[PDB]
Design a binder for these strands. Structure first.
Lengths: 505, 255, 244
DNA sequence: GACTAGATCAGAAGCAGTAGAGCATGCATAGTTT
DNA sequence: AAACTATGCATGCTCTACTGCTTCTGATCTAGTCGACT
C-alpha cells in the first residue's frame, strides 16, 4: 500500500432527503453530515495525510471546474482540518438546514453521469500519488432516472469508465418511507455487489453505524525499521527486515507559537566562547570527564569509536532450547524479523527452512545484534513464529522470527533476602475460589490509553470550539463495585483465615 | 481617533452575530493591538460564548472576560466606557476588589442611581432562592409595607385583614368542601386582593364572611365567645363595595 | 530501594507489598562534558537557545512570548501549558489494583511492553501479608493464571495495564510484573505466508542440511548424570562489554 | 531548428525511532532539633 | 518522642543529534507541429 487515500462524499439534495418520516428521527441530510464529520475526525486523528472532498449535487447553484449545472463542490480534495469540520457543522442544525437551502437550494434536476464526471475530474486534479480512489454516494433514492432512460445509459457508461479507471464506489443508502431497492438501478453502478444486499432495505445501511464509530488511534503503514544482514557464516549471508509489531504510543510533540499572532516560531541554538565571542562547531570542541581530581579529554570521534565492536547486523552464534528462555528475562519490546529478498536472492528459502526446522526442534537461534554503527552489540534470541489465522481466513500472527533481547549481567539486580512462608491448603483454596469468581477473558486490545484519549478529546474541543470535552470513560479502572457484589462473603472468610483480628491493614 | 492607545486585546468570540474577523479588524483600525492569545500585558478578553477556552480563562483567575457588547457600545460612542458588572463575565481578584467597594455584590451600584431597565437587570442577576416560608414571607412583606407607608395600594388593601369563609359544612374539616357558586369566587377575589384565607379556623382569624346561608350564624356566634379576640361576620356586599370604590369600606354597615 | 504499595483485589481486600526492579537496562551515569578545545575549561563554552519568526528579518521573540500548541491537521491550535495541566487526565497515584485474572496462555511474551520488570514481594516483617501473598501465588500457579492489573508509580506516572504472574522458587516466592500493550500500541502488519508459498519451497536436501546445521550448533548439552540441560554459552551472566 | 510537450531517473525533505543529556517534582527514608 | 530538614531516587518531559525508509521534486532525453533552408 503506497500512496494516499482519496474520499469524495456525494450528498443528494432532493426534496425527499429533507423530510423525516417519524418524529425524533434526524433527517437523512443531517445524518450524512454527521457521518462526514465523524469520518473527517477519524481521518484527522488516525492519518491527516489523506485527502477528503465534499460535493453536493441537485442544488440550484453550481460550482464546478467545468461549470456543470446543478452540481456544487463544497470542498475540493485536500487534507482535513477544523475549518472544513466547522463548515460542515454549519448545516448540522435546522437553522443550518435553512442556511443550506438558502445558499445552495434544492429540488432541481440532475444527472448521475455529470456527478461522476466531476468526481473523476476532481480525482485527476490531485498531483499526489493516490493509493486508493474511493467515492461515497449518500442518497435515499433508488430510481432517480425513472422518467428518462438516456440518462440511465449515460450513468451506466460513466460508472463503467470509473470502474475501469480504478475508482471504487459505494452507495450509502439511507432510510426511505417506502423502501430502498438496490437491485433496481444502482446494482450496475456499485463496484462490488453483495448477494445479501439484494432485498429491499427498510432501515439504515449497516455501513453508517461503522462510519459513525469514531476511532482515536494513529495508523502506521507497514515499514521496515532496518534491512539488516544475518550472517550464519562469514560467507553465508542473507538479508532480513526488522519491524516493530508493538510500539509505544506517544502524543504529538508540542509546537511553539507566537502569542501575538499564533504563528510557528523557528528554534535555533548556537555555541560561542565567552571570551572570543565567535561561533563554534562540533569539530572545534573536546569532551571532558572529571573523576575526582583528574581530567580526561577525548575527541568526539574517539567517544563514538569507544562503542564500536562490529558492523551493523545480526551474526548467528548457535541454537538453544526454548526451555532455557526465561519468561521474566524481559528488557525491551520484542521485534519481528522477516526475509526481504530485495537485496540478496535465495534468502527466502533459507529463512523458511530455518523456521520450519526450528519449529520442529523447538530451538531458538541465538545471535549478536548491532542495530546501527557505533552501537554496542547485544545478545538476542530469534524464536520461530507459526503463521496463525483465525476463522474466515484472517491472519493474526504472521510467519517469521520473534527477536527477544537477552538481559546482560549488569541489567539484573539482586533482590533482598526474604524468608519463605507457605500458605495452608485452606487459604489457597479460598484464593482459588476468589480467582475463579473473578475469571475474565483477556485480549490484546481490551484497554485504551486514558491519557492519549483525553488529550485527543481536549484537542478536539479546542479545535471545534465545543462547549466541553466529552469525558472519555477509562476501562483501566477495576470497577470495584461489580467485584464486591460478585465476590460476596469470600473476602471476609479469606481475611478471617489469614488476617488476624488485630491487624488493621 | 485613537481612543484605544496601545492596548492589548484578546478576542475569543465564536457563535455570535458579529464574527471574529470584523471585531479584530475594528480593534486593529481603532489604534488597538489585537492578539490571538492572552498574556501578562492583556487587560481584558472579549468572549461572546462560554466555550472551553473561556471556561479555562475563567478558572485561571488572572484575566477579565468581557462580553462583546462592551466593545460594540465603545464603538457606538467612540469613547472608553467604564466597566460594569453586566459586561463582565469574570472578575480578577483586583477587579473584584475594585467592584466590591464601588458596586454591590449583585449587579447594582451604591452611588449611581437605578432606573427601570437597570433594576430589571439587577433582579435578573439574582436567582430565586427557597430559604423563605409562606407565613414568614407574608409577615415580612406586611412589615415592609407598613414601615414605608405602602398601605394605600389597591391590591394590598386586605393585607392586614384575614378572612375566613363558610365554604365547609363542618368547621376545621377539609373533607367537607362545599360546591358554592358565589362563595368560591368571592374567596378567590379576596385572596387575589391580598387577603389571607385559611382553611382551618385558628386563633389568628380576624374577619369572617358568610353568604346567604344564615343557619351557621349561631354556630359562629357561639364559637367567637370562646375566642380571646372576637371576629366579625360581614355580608358579601362589603367586599364588592370595597373593590368597586377601590378602598376599604367600614364594616359597621355590613356587620 | 523498595516501592511500597497495596495490592487490592476489591474495595475491602488489600495486601501490603513491596516492588523492586528485577531487570533494568544499565547506562553510564557520567555524561561527557563539552569544553573548549584550547583552555579545556567548561566556563568558556555557552549554549544559548533563541526563537525567531518565519521571516527574513528574523524578528526576535522573548521566551515568555511563546505559547504551546498542537497540530490538528492542516492547522495548529494553541494549547497553553496551564490549560493542558488543568485538562490533563488525572488519577490517584500509587495504585496497584488487580483488574482481573486470565489464563496464562492468553498472555504472550511478544506483547510485553515497557523497559523494566518488577518483582513484588510481601511487606517486610509482615506475617499476614506474606501468608496472603503466598496463598495468592499458589492459587494462581495451581490454576495456571495471571493477574491483569493497573499500575501507577505516583500521581504523575501515567497509568499502565500489566500482567503479574507467579514466580515460585525453593529459596523464595514472589510475583513478576511486566507491562502490557494498549490497543493503540499494536501494529497490524500483513505478511505473505511462507508455508503455502510455492516460489520459496525448500527441497528435502536443504531441510536435511539445515537440520544437520542446527544439531551441530546446539549450545545446550543433555547431561545424563541428572538428565538435565546445561547451557554452554549463557549470555545472561556475561557482563556488558561497553562498560569494560 | 526550435519549442513544448512527455517520460524518467537522481537528490532533498519529511517522518519514525533511538540514544544521550538536563530538569520537574513528589514520594520515601535517614539525620538533626525542640 | 515528635517536628523539621536532608539526601536520594525515580519517571515524565524537552532538545539535539544520529541513522534509515518513503515520497516529492528538478534535471535530462524524444514526438509532433510549425517553420526555415537547399
Amino acid at each position: 500500500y503506497s500512496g494516499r487515500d482519496s474520499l469524495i462524499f456525494l450528498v443528494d439534495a432532493s426534496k425527499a432527503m429533507f423530510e423525516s418520516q417519524s418524529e425524533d428521527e434526524l433527517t437523512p441530510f443531517d445524518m450524512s453530515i454527521q457521518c462526514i464529520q465523524s469520518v473527517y475526525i477519524s481521518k484527522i486523528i488516525s492519518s491527516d495525510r489523506d485527502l477528503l472532498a465534499v460535493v453536493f449535487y441537485g442544488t440550484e447553484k453550481d460550482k464546478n471546474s467545468v461549470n456543470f449545472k446543478n452540481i456544487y463542490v463544497l470542498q475540493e480534495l485536500d487534507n482535513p482540518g477544523a475549518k472544513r469540520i466547522l463548515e460542515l457543522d454549519q448545516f448540522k442544525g435546522q437553522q443550518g438546514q435553512k442556511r443550506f437551502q438558502d445558499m445552495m437550494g434544492h429540488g432541481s434536476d440532475y444527472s448521475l453521469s455529470e456527478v461522476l464526471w466531476v468526481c473523476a475530474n476532481l480525482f485527476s486534479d490531485v498531483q499526489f500519488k493516490m493509493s486508493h480512489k474511493r467515492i461515497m454516494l449518500f442518497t435515499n433514492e433508488d430510481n432517480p432516472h425513472g422518467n428518462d432512460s438516456a440518462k440511465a445509459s449515460r450513468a451506466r457508461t460513466k460508472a463503467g469508465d470509473l470502474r475501469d479507471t480504478g475508482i471504487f464506489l459505494d452507495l450509502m443508502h439511507l432510510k426511505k418511507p417506502g423502501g430502498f431497492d438496490i437491485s433496481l438501478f444502482y446494482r450496475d453502478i456499485i463496484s462490488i455487489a453483495e448477494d445479501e444486499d439484494l432485498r429491499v432495505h427498510f432501515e439504515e445501511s449497516s455501513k453508517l453505524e461503522d462510519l459513525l464509530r469514531k476511532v482515536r488511534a494513529k495508523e502506521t503503514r507497514k515499514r521496515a525499521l532496518s534491512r539488516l544482514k544475518l550472517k550464519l557464516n562469514k560467507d553465508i549471508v542473507i538479508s532480513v527486515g526488522i519491524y516493530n509489531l508493538v510500539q509505544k504510543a506517544l502524543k504529538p510533540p508540542p509546537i511553539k507559537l507566537y502569542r501575538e499572532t499564533n504563528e510557528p516560531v523557528k528554534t535555533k541554538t548556537r555555541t560561542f566562547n565567552t571570551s572570543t565571542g565567535g561561533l563554534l562547531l562540533p569539530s572545534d570542541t573536546k569532551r571532558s570527564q572529571i573523576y575526582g581530581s583528574r581530567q580526561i579529554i577525548l575527541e568526539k570521534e574517539e567517544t563514538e569509536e569507544l562503542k564500536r565492536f562490529d558492523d551493523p547486523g545480526l551474526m548467528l552464534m548457535g541454537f538453544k532450547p526454548l526451555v532455557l528462555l526465561k519468561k521474566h528475562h524481559y528488557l525491551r519490546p520484542s521485534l519481528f524479523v522477516y526475509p526481504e529478498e530485495s537485496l540478496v536472492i535465495g534468502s527466502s528459502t533459507l529463512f523458511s527452512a530455518l523456521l520450519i526446522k526450528c519449529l520442529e526442534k523447538e530451538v531458538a537461534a541465538l545471535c549478536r545484534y548491532t542495530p546501527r554503527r557505533n552501537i554496542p552489540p547485544y545478545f538476542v534470541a530469534l524464536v520461530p513464529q507459526e503463521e496463525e489465522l483465525d476463522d474466515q481466513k484472517i491472519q493474526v500472527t504472521p510467519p517469521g522470527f520473534q527477536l527477544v533481547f537477552l538481559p546482560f549481567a549488569d541489567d539484573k539486580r539482586k533482590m533482598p533476602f526474604t524468608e519463605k512462608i507457605m500458605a495452608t491448603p485452606e487459604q489457597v483454596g479460598k484464593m482459588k475460589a476468589i480467582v475463579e469468581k473473578l475469571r475474565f477473558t483477556y485480549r490484546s486490545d481490551s484497554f485504551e490509553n486514558p491519557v492519549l484519549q483525553q488529550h485527543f478529546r481536549n484537542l478536539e474541543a479546542l479545535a471545534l470550539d465545543l462547549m466541553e470535552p466529552e469525558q472519555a470513560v477509562d476501562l483501566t479502572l477495576p470497577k470495584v463495585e461489580a467485584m464486591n457484589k460478585r465476590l460476596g462473603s469470600l473476602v471476609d472468610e479469606f481475611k478471617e483465615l489469614v488476617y488476624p483480628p488485630d491487624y488493621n491493614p | 481617533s485613537n481612543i484605544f492607545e496601545d492596548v492589548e486585546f484578546c478576542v475569543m468570540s465564536g457563535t455570535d452575530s458579529q464574527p471574529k474577523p470584523d471585531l479584530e479588524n475594528r480593534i486593529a483600525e481603532f489604534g488597538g493591538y489585537i492578539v490571538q492569545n492572552p498574556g501578562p500585558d492583556t487587560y481584558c478578553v472579549i468572549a461572546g460564548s462560554e466555550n472551553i477556552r473561556v471556561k479555562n480563562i475563567i478558572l485561571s483567575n488572572k484575566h477579565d472576560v468581557v462580553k462583546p457588547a462592551w466593545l460594540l457600545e465603545c464603538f457606538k460612542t467612540k469613547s472608553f466606557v467604564p466597566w460594569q458588572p453586566r459586561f463582565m463575565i469574570h472578575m480578577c481578584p483586583s477587579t473584584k476588589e475594585h467592584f466590591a467597594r464601588e458596586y454591590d455584590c449583585y449587579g447594582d451600584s451604591y452611588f449611581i442611581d437605578t432606573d427601570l431597565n437597570q433594576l430589571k437587570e439587577v433582579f435578573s442577576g439574582i436567582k430565586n432562592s427557597n430559604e423563605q416560608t409562606p407565613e414568614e414571607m407574608a409577615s415580612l412583606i406586611a412589615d415592609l409595607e407598613y414601615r414605608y407607608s405602602w398601605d394605600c395600594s389597591p391590591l394590598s388593601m386586605f393585607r392586614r385583614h384575614t378572612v375566613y369563609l363558610d365554604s365547609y359544612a363542618v368547621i376545621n374539616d377539609l373533607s367537607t368542601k362545599n360546591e358554592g357558586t358565589r362563595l368560591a369566587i368571592k374567596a378567590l377575589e379576596l385572596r387575589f386582593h391580598g387577603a389571607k384565607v385559611v382553611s382551618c379556623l385558628a386563633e389568628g382569624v380576624s374577619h369572617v364572611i358568610i353568604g346567604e346561608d344564615h343557619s351557621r350564624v349561631a354556630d359562629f356566634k357561639a364559637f367567637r365567645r370562646t375566642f380571646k379576640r372576637k371576629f366579625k361576620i360581614l355580608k358579601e356586599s362589603w367586599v364588592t363595595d370595597s373593590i368597586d370604590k377601590c378602598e376599604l369600606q367600614e364594616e359597621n354597615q355590613y356587620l | 530501594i523498595h516501592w511500597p504499595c497495596r495490592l487490592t483485589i476489591g474495595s475491602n481486600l488489600s495486601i501490603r507489598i513491596a516492588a523492586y526492579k528485577s531487570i533494568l537496562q544499565e547506562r553510564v551515569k557520567k555524561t561527557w562534558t563539552v569544553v573548549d578545545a584550547k583552555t579545556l575549561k567548561k566556563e568558556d563554552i555557552q549554549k544559548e537557545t533563541v526563537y525567531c519568526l518565519n521571516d527574513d528579518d528574523e524578528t526576535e521573540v522573548l521566551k515568555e512570548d511563546i505559547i504551546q500548541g498542537f497540530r490538528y491537521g492542516s492547522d495548529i491550535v494553541p494549547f497553553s501549558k496551564v490549560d493542558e495541566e488543568q485538562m490533563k487526565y488525572k488519577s490517584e497515584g500509587k495504585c496497584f489494583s488487580v483488574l482481573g485474572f486470565c489464563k496464562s496462555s492468553q498472555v504472550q511474551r511478544r506483547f510485553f511492553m515497557g523497559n523494566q520488570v518488577l518483582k513484588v514481594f510481601a511487606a517486610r516483617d509482615d506475617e499476614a501479608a506474606a501468608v496472603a501473598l503466598s496463598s495468592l501465588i499458589h492459587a494462581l500457579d495451581d490454576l495456571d493464571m495471571v493477574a491483569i492489573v493497573r499500575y501507577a508509580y505516583d500521581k504523575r506516572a501515567n497509568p499502565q495495564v500489566g500482567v503479574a504472574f507467579p514466580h515460585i522458587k525453593h529459596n523464595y516466592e514472589c510475583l513478576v510484573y511486566v507491562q502490557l500493550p494498549f490497543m493503540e500500541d499494536l501494529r497490524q502488519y500483513m505478511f505473505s505466508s511462507l508455508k503455502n508459498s510455492k516460489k520459496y519451497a525448500p527441497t528435502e536436501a536443504q531441510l536435511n542440511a539445515v537440520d544437520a546445521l542446527i544439531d551441530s550448533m546446539s549450545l545446550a548439552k543433555k547431561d545424563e548424570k541428572t538428565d538435565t540441560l546445561e547451557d554452554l554459552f549463557p549470555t545472561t551472566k556475561i557482563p556488558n562489554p561497553r562498560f569494560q
